[PDB]
């Protein structure tokens, strides 16, 4: 359907941002877990794959900054910064998708 195709990008990006928020929350919750390597996903490549193939993300390890004796890779400054940025981009996606839907609704309003 065309109504799906016109709205597909922002919906898929919003879903990916929700999944990456889940991953970042898992990284923050594991901030003191020994032997835990911080995980993330590359948003741009994953979104390009989602659009090209059609709708299982590739979890890439974050490079550590400084070594810790307990084998914990989670750097909390980078995690907090990325969490805030991801939240902001999720709000952006919500606003843009709502703008598209409200534009369609105002078009239909007689």
């Amino acid at each position: 359907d065309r109504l799906d195709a016109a709205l597909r990008f922002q919906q898929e990006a919003l879903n990916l941002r929700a999944q990456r928020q889940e991953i970042l929350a898992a990284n923050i919750a594991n901030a003191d877990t020994p032997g835990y390597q911080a995980r993330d996903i590359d948003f741009a490549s994953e979104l390009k794959k989602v659009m090209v193939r059609g709708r299982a993300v590739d979890l890439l390890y974050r490079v550590p900054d400084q070594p810790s004796l307990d084998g914990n890779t989670v750097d909390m400054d980078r995690e907090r910064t990325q969490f805030a940025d991801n939240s902001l981009k999720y709000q952006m996606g919500l606003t843009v998708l709502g703008s598209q839907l409200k534009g369609m609704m105002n078009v239909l309003q007689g």
Binding site: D32, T33, P34, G35, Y36, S68, L69, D70
Partner: peptide
């Protein structure tokens, strides 16, 4: 997988 968080896993220990 993991172990004791904090004090007991952040000190130099003999190999074992």
């Amino acid at each position: 997988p993991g172990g004791v968080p904090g004090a007991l896993s952040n000190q130099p220990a003999p190999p074992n």
